[PDB]
Amino acid sequence: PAPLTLIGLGPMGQAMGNALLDRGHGLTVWNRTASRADALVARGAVRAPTVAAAVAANELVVLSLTDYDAMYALLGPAADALAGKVVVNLSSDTPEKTRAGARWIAEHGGTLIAGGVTCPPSGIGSPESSAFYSGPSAAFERHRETLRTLTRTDYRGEDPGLAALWYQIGMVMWWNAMLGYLQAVALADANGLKAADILPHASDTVAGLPFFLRFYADRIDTGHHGGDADRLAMGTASVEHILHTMADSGVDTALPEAVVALFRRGEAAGYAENSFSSMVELLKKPS
């Protein structure tokens, strides 16, 4: 296993360093809050005295930060020592800001590989976990084996915005579902039910979603938005029932209103008798 530097020891960076040490990588770590490296150092990781010494320790520099602005904040001061470094940035951001980070790293002699990890910290090091990757192909292939300690690698192409784009595509569904979980837990709590009580039914419900994803994928892709499978107005009534159920129980209705508002836009566009999938045509229009 090759040596490498890991900068950023939040929940994902910690899980990353432990998986790299489990594999035997010679690991050099640095974190703004130095306290968070103590456990990794006790396992054998090398604590870098500064962020510049961390970058200087290895060719491979893995970042796990909040966004790409944090990369400039951490790497900016010693940016003149980034020449010849491979920076694998595993931080979420937009495709545009991901490309800007790649341009900035190139200006200073390094090369950036963009990554999007699709697993929680407990999934790091597990072969069922995956991460999108995009950036220079030669630099990626050269360090793929090291990156495969963390997750399976899904290389998407040269453009760094690709891995970020694929990450956001899955994350918009993920956050939508998880906030709906909190909304369902909030409704349950208003009626004397715990998250543990609704957990089996909530799990059963989302576990059946892939069949609907497959059913509607090919319908959306051929432009088949006919109301033969479902009628949008019937979905409006369904989401109106959710909203008013929430309101009757005194639970917040900000997100249920937003969902109802989109169905109302669907009906305002004349899609009442078409499938609810027709709202993808509204969602494609800007603003």
Ligand X SMILES: NC(=O)C1=CN([C@@H]2O[C@H](COP(=O)(O)OP(=O)(O)OC[C@H]3O[C@@H](n4cnc5c(N)ncnc54)[C@H](OP(=O)(O)O)[C@@H]3O)[C@@H](O)[C@H]2O)C=CC1
Ligand Y SMILES: Fc1ccc(F)c(C2=NCCC2)c1
Name the site residues for ligand X (rule: CB under 6 A): 8-13, 31-33, 36, 64-66, 70, 73-74, 90-92, 117, 120-121, 230-231, 234, 238
**Separation CA 81–CA 87 (nearest Å):** 12
Sequence length of the chain is 287
Q: How far is the CB of 99 from a copy of itself (least distance, A)?
A: 10
Breaks in the chain (C to N > 2.5 A) come right after none
> Between residues 44 and 120, which has the closer beta carbon with respect to ligand Y?
120
Q: How far is the CB of 286 from ligand X (least distance, A)?
A: 25
Indicate the DSSP class of residue 49: S
* SS3 (DSSP) at 154: strand
- Interaction residues for a copy of itself, span 161-220 (CB under 8 A): 164-166, 168-191, 193-196, 198-199, 201-207, 209-218, 220
- Interaction residues for a copy of itself, span 67-96 (CB under 8 A): 67, 92-96
* SS3 (DSSP) at 123: helix
Strands 60-63 and 86-89: parallel
Which of ligand Y, ligand X, a copy of itself, none has residue 36 at its interface (CB below 5 to 8 Å by kind)?
ligand X
Token pair listed for 63: 């970042």
Assess 274 for contact with a copy of itself (CB under 8 A).
no
- Interaction residues for ligand Y, span 87-126 (CB under 6 A): 118, 120
**Strand blocks (E) in the chain:** 4-7, 27-30, 46-47, 60-63, 86-89, 111-117, 130-134, 152-157
Q: What is the DSSP string of 216-277?
A: HHHHHHTT---TTS--HHHHHHHHHHHHHHHHHTT---HHHHHHHHHHHHHHHTT-TTS-GG
Which of ligand X, ligand Y, a copy of itself, none has residue 89 at its interface (CB below 5 to 8 Å by kind)?
none
Q: Which residue type sits at 198? A: I
> Between residues 122 and 194, which has the closer beta carbon with respect to ligand X?
122
- State the binding string over 238-267 for ligand Y (x if CB under 6 A, else -): x-----------------------------
What are residue 6's phi and psi, to 5 degrees? -125, 120
Assess 230 for contact with ligand Y (CB under 6 A).
yes
Assess 126 for contact with a copy of itself (CB under 8 A).
no
Indicate the DSSP class of residue 48: P
Q: How far is the CB of 238 from ligand Y (least distance, A)?
A: 4
Which of ligand Y, a copy of itself, ligand X, none has residue 268 at its interface (CB below 5 to 8 Å by kind)?
none
Token pair listed for 280: 């993808």
- Interaction residues for a copy of itself, span 27-66 (CB under 8 A): 66
H or E stretch at 145:
helix 137-150
- State the binding string over 159-198 for ligand Y (x if CB under 6 A, else -): ---------------x------------------------
> Between residues 4 and 167, which has the closer beta carbon with respect to a copy of itself?
167
Q: Give the binding range for ligand Y (CB under 6 A) out of 2-10, 96-104, 232-240, 260-268.
A: 232-240
Residues that bind ligand Y (CB under 6 A): 118, 120, 174, 230, 234-235, 238, 276
